[PDB]
Amino acid sequence: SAPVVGIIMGSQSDWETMRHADALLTELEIPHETLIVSAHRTPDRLADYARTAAERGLNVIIAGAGGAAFLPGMCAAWTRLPVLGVPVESRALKGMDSLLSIVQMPGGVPVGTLAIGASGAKNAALLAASILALYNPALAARLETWRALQTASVPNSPITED
Amino acid sequence: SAPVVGIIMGSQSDWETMRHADALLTELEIPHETLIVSAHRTPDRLADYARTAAERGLNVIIAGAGGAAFLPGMCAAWTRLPVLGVPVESRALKGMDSLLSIVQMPGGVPVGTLAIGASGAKNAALLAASILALYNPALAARLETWRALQTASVPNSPI
Amino acid sequence: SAPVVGIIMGSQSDWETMRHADALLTELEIPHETLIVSAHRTPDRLADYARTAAERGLNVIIAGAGGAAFLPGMCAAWTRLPVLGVPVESRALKGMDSLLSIVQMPGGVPVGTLAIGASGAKNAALLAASILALYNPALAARLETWRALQTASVPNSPITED
Amino acid sequence: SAPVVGIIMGSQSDWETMRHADALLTELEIPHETLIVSAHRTPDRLADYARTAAERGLNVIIAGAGGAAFLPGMCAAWTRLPVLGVPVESRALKGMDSLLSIVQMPGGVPVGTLAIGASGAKNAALLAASILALYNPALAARLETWRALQTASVPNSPI
Amino acid sequence: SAPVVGIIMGSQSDWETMRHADALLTELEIPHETLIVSAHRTPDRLADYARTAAERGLNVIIAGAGGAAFLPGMCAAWTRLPVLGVPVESRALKGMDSLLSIVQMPGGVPVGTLAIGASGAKNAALLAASILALYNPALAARLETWRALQTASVPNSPITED
Amino acid sequence: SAPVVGIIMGSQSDWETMRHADALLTELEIPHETLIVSAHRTPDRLADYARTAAERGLNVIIAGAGGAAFLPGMCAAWTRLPVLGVPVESRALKGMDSLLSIVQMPGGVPVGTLAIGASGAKNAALLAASILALYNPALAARLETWRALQTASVPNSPI
Amino acid sequence: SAPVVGIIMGSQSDWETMRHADALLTELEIPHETLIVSAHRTPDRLADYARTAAERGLNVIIAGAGGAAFLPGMCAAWTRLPVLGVPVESRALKGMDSLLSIVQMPGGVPVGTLAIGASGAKNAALLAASILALYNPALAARLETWRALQTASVPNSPITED
Amino acid sequence: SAPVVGIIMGSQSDWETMRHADALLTELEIPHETLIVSAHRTPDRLADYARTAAERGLNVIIAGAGGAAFLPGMCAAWTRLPVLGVPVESRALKGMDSLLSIVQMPGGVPVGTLAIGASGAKNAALLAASILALYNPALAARLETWRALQTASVPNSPI
């Protein structure tokens, strides 16, 4: 029941995107927690969350942020755990600011970045799953099955109907 | 004598750019400190630096950073003081990543952003000067002189 | 009652964005004026406004502009006061033209630039407030309280409900 | 003898680019003046330059500027004369900032914008020439000759 | 009655933007023609139009085009007359492809480029007017009056009402 | 012996890039002509070149151009033959202007666009080869050999 | 009746764009097949499709893909046939990711890339047609007629009505 | 001794960048293999490499690629193992094409993307280390030491 993955985002507005990561982890039966931590508004909350993540049993952290997106990066600065970042699409720059802010981490502090938006949130969950599967045979089996189904479920031709 | 402006940068590599902010402040005789504080590598140092800036007597903070530039923003998250950000030019993206990372702050935690590179470092110092000038008559006069000399020194025709 | 902050914009269309700066200054009880000054259509009005701002008692100027955004920059060319620039989102280029036009000031004439749009307008007001607070204990106290409330008001978890 | 075209730039650093506009005008024997006028550093000089351009007999103004490029635009705000803008290549953003700052003029105050760099400086001169040619038969003939030579001089195969 | 300005565009879809150039020329009483010439679909029509523009009495050509926008440029390759280009906003790239395609002319063949969209179309008309005014006192007077009115018509403050 | 592929470029400056298309065609022994045709400077030459390409026996046209790159597009406007465009890297915008100018052709007049630079020039030749291979068994075999050698030659580990 | 052109796309969502290629090939009477092959979800299906395309009689392959668009490129890595790529417009980046992912092929493995979206799909079909026409007199005649009609069908002036 | 991390790149030219991932893994004493696998030139080699990665004992794959960068993505399409992608800086577009090609993976097949260039190569190794550390106490301790040294080594002021 104890969470092994932590999904964090700066505000409620990010949930529309981050819910996809939540849904996928639940689908693959991966225990996790979902919280709001703002790098700009609650920097001390972030410091404490990231600093204690390992001892609390978390193995992976999935952080979503848009615009001047610091959440994934600053989180990674305080934890040795692998941190995955989801660029949340921004209004004006369509997530380009979100993407560059997260992916361009200088050497020494990594953040595995996923695609902008929903697809990135879902993939962050899947990447976290593939990480946990390395040492969890049962989960590895569920993931393999999930991937196999995805492949087998692709249609052979498009519905070309007018 | 006590510093009223704090100039901070992520690493030695930022100095080539941030040295321009240092030179300007010195030129206008504005007491300041110039330190290295990394948002990515020394987050606690940053937290402590920003938390105590006001208490220490600092009035403005000038922070330079490139790539996923967090220094100015995170610093502003821990202080009520005006934080000015300098986007340091990055190798690949020429500071576009630096600029977006710094300027696109969400409402509630501001960072007055300047141009990418040396021009931005110099302007951060000048902007800090114009801020300090609001309550320092002597400095205000020196800033007026600096701006006047800048304007008067522009040649009338190219060489 | 005398204004210490000047909020200027090129046209009525900018008000939708600049009203956020106005609202925040009023919220923090900072006396200010709100005017329309077009760098392209009323260059002499701009020259006079910027040139006399200091003697008129203004301490900070917040200027909004989009597209070929010259208002903040040209204003700064005529005043020694700190000028803050708000990139107003443009139709086609989503404020990227507005942003580069304002932030890329050459060495010698600064403009503290904020984010594109509403968030930038609000932050320009907050930055102006943090500047005025340096020499206004009462305002400093109001700002500190405002910042503290912002931090304390951040929810701990997202409303994950379907 | 009196100049009919005014070439202006923010600083000496723009000369490397704007010298191409000067060379072209000279080649076509178009009387012109080449000056330094900074929108940021010498705003009053700019205002005066633009306000009086028409009175002085100038027909077209070619203005070069980089980064937050305001020279062409602000000049057009003070004159009814055609203003052509040359985006000077900037260090970091390679003139993309220069280009957007100049070309994106709102309706009501135009600036005919040319390509970033030397090509743009040369074309501003040529565009000014084509404008002047509309009411100067002699120049029109010289422009026709220039364009004809350009076309005829292109090699048929690479070396 | 003979046209002195030629407004051309690649298709009917460009009219929504180019109509602003048409309206402004008419407003300033500048005789002009409005035609459709496609650089991609009617290259020979373009060659002939541009090649004969001068002898037909045209003094300025205003060409609008979007995407791989060649109309202004190719027109300029066939005429000695000044050619003004209007980048028509494109669906996906918002006119950025239109803008670069038109403004980046190599040294030797100029195109005075205006802003993306409606504002650019209107300004192309105004630029054409300022060119014609150089040798047409009456038009020069109308333009001066138009510019003066624009400046005088700018409001002093925004309608800040809720 | 008669050329079946025509390689064209706006000027000598494009040769550094387009020479790669020439080398590849020669390597695969594909008869071709390499000429300079400027869309901006020699529009009539271009019109004539494109109008008569088919009649002359050409099967594919490879056109290189940078900046406001019109060569490939305008050529395609005058011929029914497949036109492949190579975006030449531009000084300031690094070929982004070249790429958008070429690839964003409206429906009705296509241009098969390749990568910016030398890689694109080489691929245009290869793409032209794959087209010609559809009806030339000998060439098809040589292309298969070329592709096979490319694949087999890749090292297993870095030096 | 045997297909000489293969139109492939990663999912049903691409059909809205790829249908234009299908429609044009049918219009010019070019036999073709339309299938769904995902480079990400069905990599082995792609390998087999591309590898056997030539022996199956296919002469040209038109592949559409958006975002991290690998379909055209990977297809070209397995076939000697000419592969044409259609960048499918993406939500956030408007097809810019699609465009760069497809057009920037390294030297050695080409992909003739067309414009982003519908126009690109239609042009991929036309390019494929111009390729097939090189050795099919009847088709060459149909294409010539199609091109001639396009040119002749362009209106001479825009419907300037209010 | 058996490799637990596989570092792959499209060609020798990527080594200048990917060597940083190799150095980091060696520094942390993480058994790994460093190979050249081209998505464009050796697709079957890639398919085989990715299909069998898990069976061979590999835990994480680090793939570097530039331009139309497919290596990381296609590799992830054939393996259930975590795939980390390094955007190699491209000549013209400075790795922007590399970055978008790698990071914009559709839902269902992920690739943890790192920064463009050497910084990204180094971080991919570190990220792979943090993953491996989850089930390797010894390595976890070494990673903690590495991160601690990085933090403690940052100077307090610029030289």
PDB file of N, CA, C and O in Angstrom, chain E residues 108-132:
ATOM      1  N   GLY E 108      20.232  42.071 -53.868  1.00  0.00           N
ATOM      2  CA  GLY E 108      20.042  42.245 -55.298  1.00  0.00           C
ATOM      3  C   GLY E 108      18.595  42.346 -55.737  1.00  0.00           C
ATOM      4  O   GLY E 108      18.288  43.003 -56.726  1.00  0.00           O
ATOM      5  N   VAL E 109      17.700  41.690 -55.007  1.00  0.00           N
ATOM      6  CA  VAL E 109      16.275  41.718 -55.334  1.00  0.00           C
ATOM      7  C   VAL E 109      15.503  41.968 -54.046  1.00  0.00           C
ATOM      8  O   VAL E 109      15.228  41.047 -53.279  1.00  0.00           O
ATOM      9  N   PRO E 110      15.139  43.234 -53.793  1.00  0.00           N
ATOM     10  CA  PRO E 110      14.404  43.610 -52.584  1.00  0.00           C
ATOM     11  C   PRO E 110      12.892  43.425 -52.582  1.00  0.00           C
ATOM     12  O   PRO E 110      12.239  43.370 -53.626  1.00  0.00           O
ATOM     13  N   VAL E 111      12.362  43.338 -51.368  1.00  0.00           N
ATOM     14  CA  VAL E 111      10.935  43.257 -51.103  1.00  0.00           C
ATOM     15  C   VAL E 111      10.779  43.921 -49.742  1.00  0.00           C
ATOM     16  O   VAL E 111      11.330  43.437 -48.751  1.00  0.00           O
ATOM     17  N   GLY E 112      10.074  45.049 -49.707  1.00  0.00           N
ATOM     18  CA  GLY E 112       9.840  45.739 -48.450  1.00  0.00           C
ATOM     19  C   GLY E 112       8.746  44.935 -47.779  1.00  0.00           C
ATOM     20  O   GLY E 112       7.603  44.924 -48.247  1.00  0.00           O
ATOM     21  N   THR E 113       9.094  44.258 -46.690  1.00  0.00           N
ATOM     22  CA  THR E 113       8.148  43.399 -45.991  1.00  0.00           C
ATOM     23  C   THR E 113       7.455  44.076 -44.820  1.00  0.00           C
ATOM     24  O   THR E 113       8.070  44.843 -44.084  1.00  0.00           O
ATOM     25  N   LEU E 114       6.165  43.789 -44.660  1.00  0.00           N
ATOM     26  CA  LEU E 114       5.384  44.357 -43.569  1.00  0.00           C
ATOM     27  C   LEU E 114       5.020  43.252 -42.582  1.00  0.00           C
ATOM     28  O   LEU E 114       5.328  42.076 -42.807  1.00  0.00           O
ATOM     29  N   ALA E 115       4.354  43.624 -41.495  1.00  0.00           N
ATOM     30  CA  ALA E 115       3.970  42.658 -40.472  1.00  0.00           C
ATOM     31  C   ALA E 115       3.044  41.556 -40.989  1.00  0.00           C
ATOM     32  O   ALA E 115       2.381  41.708 -42.018  1.00  0.00           O
ATOM     33  N   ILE E 116       3.010  40.443 -40.264  1.00  0.00           N
ATOM     34  CA  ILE E 116       2.140  39.322 -40.610  1.00  0.00           C
ATOM     35  C   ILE E 116       0.673  39.746 -40.468  1.00  0.00           C
ATOM     36  O   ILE E 116       0.305  40.417 -39.503  1.00  0.00           O
ATOM     37  N   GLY E 117      -0.149  39.376 -41.445  1.00  0.00           N
ATOM     38  CA  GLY E 117      -1.571  39.669 -41.380  1.00  0.00           C
ATOM     39  C   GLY E 117      -2.103  41.042 -41.752  1.00  0.00           C
ATOM     40  O   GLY E 117      -1.445  41.833 -42.432  1.00  0.00           O
ATOM     41  N   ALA E 118      -3.328  41.297 -41.293  1.00  0.00           N
ATOM     42  CA  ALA E 118      -4.063  42.538 -41.539  1.00  0.00           C
ATOM     43  C   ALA E 118      -3.251  43.814 -41.333  1.00  0.00           C
ATOM     44  O   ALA E 118      -3.292  44.722 -42.165  1.00  0.00           O
ATOM     45  N   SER E 119      -2.523  43.888 -40.227  1.00  0.00           N
ATOM     46  CA  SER E 119      -1.705  45.062 -39.945  1.00  0.00           C
ATOM     47  C   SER E 119      -0.672  45.284 -41.045  1.00  0.00           C
ATOM     48  O   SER E 119      -0.361  46.421 -41.395  1.00  0.00           O
ATOM     49  N   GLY E 120      -0.142  44.190 -41.580  1.00  0.00           N
ATOM     50  CA  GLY E 120       0.846  44.295 -42.639  1.00  0.00           C
ATOM     51  C   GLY E 120       0.227  44.769 -43.941  1.00  0.00           C
ATOM     52  O   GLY E 120       0.831  45.549 -44.683  1.00  0.00           O
ATOM     53  N   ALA E 121      -0.983  44.299 -44.220  1.00  0.00           N
ATOM     54  CA  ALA E 121      -1.676  44.692 -45.438  1.00  0.00           C
ATOM     55  C   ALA E 121      -1.982  46.184 -45.378  1.00  0.00           C
ATOM     56  O   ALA E 121      -1.779  46.910 -46.348  1.00  0.00           O
ATOM     57  N   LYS E 122      -2.467  46.645 -44.232  1.00  0.00           N
ATOM     58  CA  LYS E 122      -2.780  48.056 -44.077  1.00  0.00           C
ATOM     59  C   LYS E 122      -1.512  48.901 -44.218  1.00  0.00           C
ATOM     60  O   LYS E 122      -1.516  49.925 -44.902  1.00  0.00           O
ATOM     61  N   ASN E 123      -0.430  48.461 -43.581  1.00  0.00           N
ATOM     62  CA  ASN E 123       0.831  49.189 -43.641  1.00  0.00           C
ATOM     63  C   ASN E 123       1.485  49.178 -45.016  1.00  0.00           C
ATOM     64  O   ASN E 123       2.214  50.101 -45.360  1.00  0.00           O
ATOM     65  N   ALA E 124       1.234  48.136 -45.798  1.00  0.00           N
ATOM     66  CA  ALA E 124       1.801  48.065 -47.137  1.00  0.00           C
ATOM     67  C   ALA E 124       1.154  49.194 -47.930  1.00  0.00           C
ATOM     68  O   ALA E 124       1.816  49.875 -48.712  1.00  0.00           O
ATOM     69  N   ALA E 125      -0.148  49.384 -47.714  1.00  0.00           N
ATOM     70  CA  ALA E 125      -0.895  50.442 -48.387  1.00  0.00           C
ATOM     71  C   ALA E 125      -0.344  51.801 -47.964  1.00  0.00           C
ATOM     72  O   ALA E 125      -0.117  52.673 -48.805  1.00  0.00           O
ATOM     73  N   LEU E 126      -0.123  51.974 -46.663  1.00  0.00           N
ATOM     74  CA  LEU E 126       0.406  53.231 -46.145  1.00  0.00           C
ATOM     75  C   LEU E 126       1.823  53.503 -46.640  1.00  0.00           C
ATOM     76  O   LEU E 126       2.177  54.652 -46.911  1.00  0.00           O
ATOM     77  N   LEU E 127       2.636  52.454 -46.749  1.00  0.00           N
ATOM     78  CA  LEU E 127       4.006  52.627 -47.221  1.00  0.00           C
ATOM     79  C   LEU E 127       3.962  53.042 -48.689  1.00  0.00           C
ATOM     80  O   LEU E 127       4.706  53.926 -49.119  1.00  0.00           O
ATOM     81  N   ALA E 128       3.081  52.403 -49.451  1.00  0.00           N
ATOM     82  CA  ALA E 128       2.919  52.721 -50.864  1.00  0.00           C
ATOM     83  C   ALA E 128       2.482  54.180 -50.983  1.00  0.00           C
ATOM     84  O   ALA E 128       2.916  54.903 -51.886  1.00  0.00           O
ATOM     85  N   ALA E 129       1.618  54.607 -50.064  1.00  0.00           N
ATOM     86  CA  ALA E 129       1.126  55.981 -50.056  1.00  0.00           C
ATOM     87  C   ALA E 129       2.261  56.966 -49.771  1.00  0.00           C
ATOM     88  O   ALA E 129       2.365  58.005 -50.417  1.00  0.00           O
ATOM     89  N   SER E 130       3.115  56.637 -48.808  1.00  0.00           N
ATOM     90  CA  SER E 130       4.218  57.526 -48.462  1.00  0.00           C
ATOM     91  C   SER E 130       5.237  57.608 -49.600  1.00  0.00           C
ATOM     92  O   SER E 130       5.986  58.577 -49.702  1.00  0.00           O
ATOM     93  N   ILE E 131       5.263  56.586 -50.449  1.00  0.00           N
ATOM     94  CA  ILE E 131       6.172  56.563 -51.590  1.00  0.00           C
ATOM     95  C   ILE E 131       5.610  57.491 -52.672  1.00  0.00           C
ATOM     96  O   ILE E 131       6.327  58.330 -53.221  1.00  0.00           O
ATOM     97  N   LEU E 132       4.319  57.347 -52.953  1.00  0.00           N
ATOM     98  CA  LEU E 132       3.645  58.158 -53.966  1.00  0.00           C
ATOM     99  C   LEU E 132       3.574  59.631 -53.562  1.00  0.00           C
ATOM    100  O   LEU E 132       3.591  60.524 -54.417  1.00  0.00           O
TER     101      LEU E 132
END
